[PDB]
Amino acid sequence: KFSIYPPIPGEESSLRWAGKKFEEIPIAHIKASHNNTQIQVVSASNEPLAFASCGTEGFRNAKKGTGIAAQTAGIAAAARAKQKGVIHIRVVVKGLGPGRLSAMHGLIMGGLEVISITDNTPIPHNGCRPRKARKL
Amino acid sequence: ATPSLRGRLARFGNPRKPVLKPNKPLILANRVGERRREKGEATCITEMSVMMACWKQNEFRDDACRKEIQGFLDCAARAQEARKMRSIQETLGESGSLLPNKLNKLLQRFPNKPYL
Amino acid sequence: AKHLKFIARTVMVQEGNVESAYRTLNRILTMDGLIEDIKHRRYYEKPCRRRQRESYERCRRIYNMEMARKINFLMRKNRADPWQG
Amino acid sequence: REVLQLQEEVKNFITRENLEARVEAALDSRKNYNWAITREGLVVR
Amino acid sequence: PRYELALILKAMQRPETAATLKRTIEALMDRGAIVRDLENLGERALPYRISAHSQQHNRGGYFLVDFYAPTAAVESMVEHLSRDIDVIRGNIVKHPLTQELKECEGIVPVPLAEKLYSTKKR
Amino acid sequence: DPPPSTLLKDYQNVPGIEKVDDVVKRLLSLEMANKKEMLKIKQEQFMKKIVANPEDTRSLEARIIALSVKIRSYEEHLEKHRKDKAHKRYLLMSIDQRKKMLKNLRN
Amino acid sequence: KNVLKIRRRKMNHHKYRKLVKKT
Amino acid sequence: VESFASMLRHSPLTQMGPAKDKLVIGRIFHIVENDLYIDFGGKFHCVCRRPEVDGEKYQKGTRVRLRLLDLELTSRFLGATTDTTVLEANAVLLGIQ
Amino acid sequence: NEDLPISMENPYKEPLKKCILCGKHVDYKNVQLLSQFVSPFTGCIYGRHITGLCGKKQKEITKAIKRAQIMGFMPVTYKDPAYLKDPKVCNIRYR
RNA sequence: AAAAACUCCAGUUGACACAAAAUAGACUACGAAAGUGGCUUUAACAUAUCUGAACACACAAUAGCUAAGACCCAAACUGGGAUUAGAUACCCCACUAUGCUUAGCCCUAAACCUCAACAGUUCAACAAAACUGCUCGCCAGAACACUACGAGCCACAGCUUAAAACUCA
Ligand SMILES: [Mg+2]
Ligand SMILES: [Mg+2]
Ligand SMILES: [Mg+2]
Ligand SMILES: [Mg+2]
Ligand SMILES: [Mg+2]
Ligand SMILES: [Mg+2]
Ligand SMILES: [Mg+2]
Ligand SMILES: [Mg+2]
Ligand SMILES: [Mg+2]
Ligand SMILES: [Mg+2]
Ligand SMILES: [Zn+2]
């Protein structure tokens, strides 16, 4: 019976969260990379609420691109969102990285409720030429 | 269902250019590739996370760490017993997947031949 | 950019099953062939070597499909030997 | 016989005075081309 | 040959929509086209955001026309609709059914190729 | 250089061109269609001018005139695209075959 | 297969280029 | 005197036709504790697994009716100049006698 | 002599298989049919092994999909949400 | 891993290119080859016996030169930072020539599928089974030699053609 597809502004959406519709719920942004991951919290109407990262948490070069720093930054941003008064959150992820999976669990343990996860990762259709393959 | 390979390779009777150029000659061997390990075991990440948390809060207070450290030891023991379980399971035989040894047995009992 | 957000390549959590949602996300995206594409596009790969790798993948697919076919075809034969002698 | 079709369809072809009627009729009317197909191959709207 | 103009206007009221339509078909007649018929797709919300000559529009009005005209009329109408801002989009295409649909006898079974390698014990 | 208003080939045997509307006549004019209609009309014109037995494509001179009109079409294509070396080679090979068949016809 | 032939030719061509740019 | 061509034209197999989804009665000649092999017709016997339902009524001389797909299981692979076989025939049973 | 075989056609031949759209026509405007054969999540066109139709019709339908995409009748990223409750023909496994 | 570099830095949202065109493509189509796989239009893809110019003509991947321009990205060179005893490189950061559109030039590649075109048939080893009738082209030990000389070319550190002397088994 459960519909895995997300709701649409056109009716009908038979599921609210905290007595709220899907659209107005705040959105969390994760930008994952091999060297570091960056996390942010924003309102449904573009207003940023909280922002953190492994660098802001105080991790060095080798430690920025890890899962533990991701979990700590997630805990931090979730604490910020809860202090602001945000219970639910819509996840958005961008790119691969070590702490990609870790940020969500960090947020959950911090005390946020993830509703949906969207893979808003960039994809070029042969647009630009990346760097050449390095030889090690 | 399989993709056809009429004129993908460089043949005499194939006028157009070839598409495929495999390094080895495509002959179905009577031996199957044995399975492989996936990655290096890792566990207790959330346990050690909550442990470092309560540590930095309580200044290494064991009576307050009790629950974190108990959960960590229990998860470590679970990982160890799960390793032993999956080892005995792989030895006795993977359920749902077909074993390489008996695959080779079947293929040597009914082997294919490229020649006549 | 112009397309609207929260429609494509999404997963709705049910009963707070975040790990299952992420697993289904990986499953669908790997079946559609995106993560491989992006980890390949990370660094630029020349046309000749890309063509070689793609031919290698085609040959591997055909070989493994034939292997699975013969396995499913002859697995029924593997049973208790009725005629010992 | 093929000439028969496009010859009589000249009356259906709009003109200068028929424009301010056909344009209005078309913009008042609605048309949709969408139609799906099931497993066995039957058209469904 | 036949030419189908798929046209997308902005979501606006019937008077100015009819004005744009009558001026477009007047341009057709000036170029020398002969319209077979007009098909209204209707007003619908565009799937992805677009940018007009000076603005953006999320909704639109889909219309369709089919006509007979020479070749230079095609480029003349393309440049006309590019210059015109009331026309969000205008696209000429050939007719699919004008190309005779080749009779289809079904999918033939492909037998597995053999004699790839010579008879060698190896 | 036939006129543009000349109706299609296939619609010449039919006597319905007098009764049919002038708009339909214009539609059936070759200027509405592509250049191949004009090409075949010119082929028929050269046939009626030259050949003793029409609708005989197997004839050497029929092939010659067909390839000649094709060569003029390629010429126009080349003056439209000075860059198209593919069609340049096509024209050169066509005129080579044309000279070959011209000399064998002379023989 | 072995490539000593083209290796010799490569080395000789390299030396020729060097001498050309020198003289 | 009777020609083999006549005996074949009058054979049970030429009137049987394709074995695809055609009921046939057969019996077993060898049976392992878990499976039974029915001798039904033609060259090959068809192997089968005993169903847990009515599993007791499976002994020598049992007349079981069942459908089938082919008389011999074969398949041609890539490097198979001759198609490999199984010396068996696939068949599905839904009743006895 | 009369009982001997004879060269003859194969009446046991099952008729040639035709895809569901082998005989039907497809155009760039049938947004429903053109979004039927495409990923709802990623928006990419499914391969032939997932689709199960002849190559000519596969080429035609993918060309029409790309044409509708570039024209504006259909997007490239996300399938139209209204056409998700349609008959599912392409065989999947993730569910 | 680290160093260096920027903080006019980093993240969301709204607008924007002369840049190249996922998936389909597990498709085998076109073109003589080189190549062509985002969309629409135009013109158009030779010869209904075969072969055939290295005394000709026409193209000829990428790279490069000539004069205008275009600036996301990448990158020779170069500079800097790592590492090394040393590193004129492999690791990292910045950028130019250049990759692109015009009017030309240069005319070379593992230009290989190293398997010539046409019409056909059923064993040295390896590779992609053995072959038949005719035709053009190519080859006669290695290296000297994609060299010297000569001849031609809008080429001037070049390209095409191509030896000789001496040494060896
Ligand atoms: Mg090899
Ligand atoms: Mg592809
Ligand atoms: Mg030559
Ligand atoms: Mg250049
Ligand atoms: Mg530059
Ligand atoms: Mg090549
Ligand atoms: Mg060669
Ligand atoms: Mg030749
Ligand atoms: Mg060279
Ligand atoms: Mg020389
Ligand atoms: Zn079909």
UniProtKB/Swiss-Prot annotation, chain B:
Keywords: Disulfide bond, Mitochondrion, Nucleus, Ribonucleoprotein, Ribosomal protein. SUPFAM superfamilies: Cysteine alpha-hairpin motif. It comes from the Eukaryota. Pfam families: CHCH. Belongs to the mitochondrion-specific ribosomal protein mS37 family. One of its GO terms (biological process) is mitochondrial translation. Component of the mitochondrial small ribosomal subunit (mt-SSU). Mature mammalian 55S mitochondrial ribosomes consist of a small (28S) and a large (39S) subunit. The 28S small subunit contains a 12S ribosomal RNA (12S mt-rRNA) and 30 different proteins. The 39S large subunit contains a 16S rRNA (16S mt-rRNA), a copy of mitochondrial valine transfer RNA (mt-tRNA(Val)), which plays an integral structural role, and 52 different proteins. One of its GO terms (molecular function) is RNA binding. Its main location: mitochondrion. Residues 41-83 form the CHCH domain. This is Small ribosomal subunit protein mS37. It is found in: Mitochondrion; Nucleus. InterPro entries: CHCH (IPR010625), Cys_alpha_HP_mot_SF (IPR009069), Ribosomal_mS37_met (IPR033620). A motif (Cx9C motif 2) lies at residues 65-75. The keyword Lipid metabolism does not apply. Transmembrane segments: none annotated. PANTHER family: CHCHD1, SMALL RIBOSOMAL SUBUNIT PROTEIN MS37. One of its GO terms (cellular component) is mitochondrial inner membrane. A motif (Cx9C motif 1) lies at residues 44-54. Disulfide bonds join C44-C75, C54-C65.
UniProtKB/Swiss-Prot annotation, chain E:
GO terms for biological process: mitochondrial translation; translation. The keyword Transmembrane does not apply. Keywords: Mitochondrion, Ribonucleoprotein, Ribosomal protein. GO terms for cellular component: mitochondrial inner membrane; mitochondrial small ribosomal subunit; mitochondrion; small ribosomal subunit. Pfam families: Ribosomal_S6. One of its GO terms (molecular function) is small ribosomal subunit rRNA binding. InterPro entries: Ribosomal_bS6, Ribosomal_bS6_sf, Transl_elong_EF1B/ribsomal_bS6. It is found in: Mitochondrion. SUPFAM superfamilies: Ribosomal protein S6 (SSF54995). Component of the mitochondrial small ribosomal subunit (mt-SSU). Mature mammalian 55S mitochondrial ribosomes consist of a small (28S) and a large (39S) subunit. The 28S small subunit contains a 12S ribosomal RNA (12S mt-rRNA) and 30 different proteins. The 39S large subunit contains a 16S rRNA (16S mt-rRNA), a copy of mitochondrial valine transfer RNA (mt-tRNA(Val)), which plays an integral structural role, and 52 different proteins. Belongs to the bacterial ribosomal protein bS6 family. This is Small ribosomal subunit protein bS6m. It comes from Homo sapiens (Human). The lineage of its organism: Eukaryota, Metazoa, Chordata, Craniata, Vertebrata. The gene is MRPS6.
From Swiss-Prot, chain F:
Belongs to the universal ribosomal protein uS15 family. The chain holds residues 66 to 172 of 257 of the full protein. Component of the mitochondrial small ribosomal subunit (mt-SSU). Mature mammalian 55S mitochondrial ribosomes consist of a small (28S) and a large (39S) subunit. The 28S small subunit contains a 12S ribosomal RNA (12S mt-rRNA) and 30 different proteins. The 39S large subunit contains a 16S rRNA (16S mt-rRNA), a copy of mitochondrial valine transfer RNA (mt-tRNA(Val)), which plays an integral structural role, and 52 different proteins. Interacts with METTL17. It comes from the Eukaryota. This is Small ribosomal subunit protein uS15m. It comes from Homo sapiens (Human). It is found in: Mitochondrion matrix.
From Swiss-Prot, chain I:
Component of the mitochondrial small ribosomal subunit (mt-SSU). Mature mammalian 55S mitochondrial ribosomes consist of a small (28S) and a large (39S) subunit. The 28S small subunit contains a 12S ribosomal RNA (12S mt-rRNA) and 30 different proteins. The 39S large subunit contains a 16S rRNA (16S mt-rRNA), a copy of mitochondrial valine transfer RNA (mt-tRNA(Val)), which plays an integral structural role, and 52 different proteins. bS18m has a zinc binding site. This is Small ribosomal subunit protein bS18m. There are 3 mitochondrial isoforms of bS18 in mammalia, localizing to 3 distinct sites in the mitoribosome. bS18m (bs18c, this protein) binds to the same site as bacterial bS18, mS40 (bS18b) binds to a novel location of the 28S small subunit, and mL66 (bS18a) binds to the 39S large subunit. Its main location: mitochondrion. It comes from the Eukaryota. Belongs to the bacterial ribosomal protein bS18 family. It is found in: Mitochondrion. GO terms for biological process: mitochondrial translation; translation. GO terms for molecular function: small ribosomal subunit rRNA binding; structural constituent of ribosome. One of its GO terms (cellular component) is mitochondrion. Keywords: Mitochondrion, Ribonucleoprotein, Ribosomal protein, Transit peptide.
